[PDB]
Amino acid sequence: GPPAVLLRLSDASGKFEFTEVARGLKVKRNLLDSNDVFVLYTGAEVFAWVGKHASVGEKKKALSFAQEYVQKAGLPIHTPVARILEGGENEVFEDFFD
Amino acid sequence: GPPAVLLRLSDASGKFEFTEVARGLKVKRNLLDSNDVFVLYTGAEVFAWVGKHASVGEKKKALSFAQEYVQKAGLPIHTPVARILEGGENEVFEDFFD
Ligand SMILES: [Ca+2]
Ligand SMILES: [Ca+2]
Known part of the structure; x- marks a missing residue:
């Protein structure tokens, strides 16, 4: 969203x-790159996605940079x-792109 | 934030x-008018705050409008x-306001 x-x-x-590589409706699964780490803020959670x-x-x-995004973006403390690892079931992560 | x-x-x-009546750093506790209902999106969760x-x-x-906000804002379905009631105790809600 x-x-x-x-x-x-x-x-x-x-x-x-x-x-930052995308925001809003531009956040697409096909921007993920197995060679790197990606931080995805969904509007309800922050994922540190670890490419294979x-x-x-x-x-x-990975987590310390996801935390850095939470702090610099002003996201609330909870x-x-x-x-998460690339290829995992990661049901909540996958639902974002559903 | x-x-x-x-x-x-x-x-x-x-x-x-x-x-919408306020956003960002302007979202402050003295905007919670006891005479009405307010919906707060914190950046991670939504509250329907019910004035006494x-x-x-x-x-x-109140709750139906908070749920509809999730839909219309494109937030994750979960x-x-x-x-929450005016004067109630909610850790996450209170923490957002320091
Ligand atoms: Ca790399
Ligand atoms: Ca009223």
Whole structure:
């Protein structure tokens, strides 16, 4: 929906880059990249989605960057934050794109 | 924070009006008028706040208008929606207002 935001976390450059890649109706499943981590804010929760081929640093820091988004976006303190793996059942995550 | 939205449900005009009255950092506790119903979207959950002096119709329809807000705002279908009374104790609602 309109409040959604999708961000990419990548250290493929040699340093971490945490960049917004889409928001609102532009948040599409086909923007996810198995090589990186993605942070998805749905309007009700924040997901740290860990691609199968994400790096050791991306995987270790996935949750801390999702937390950084929660704080800088001004989301309320009970916002659920969940770390999920690519390919998992991830029913709540998958329902966002349903 | 910035994503917060506050809407007023009132039939004081002679018919039901449901309209946004504040958003972002302007969503403040002194906007909770005991005479009406207010729907608060925090960025993660929705509350139907029921003023003690709201009308019979405002109190009956409060929750339905909060649920309809989830639909019309494009929020996840499982977004928490809770009906709460003026002066009541709700941890998440109170925490949003510090
Ligand atoms: Ca990577
Ligand atoms: Ca009233």
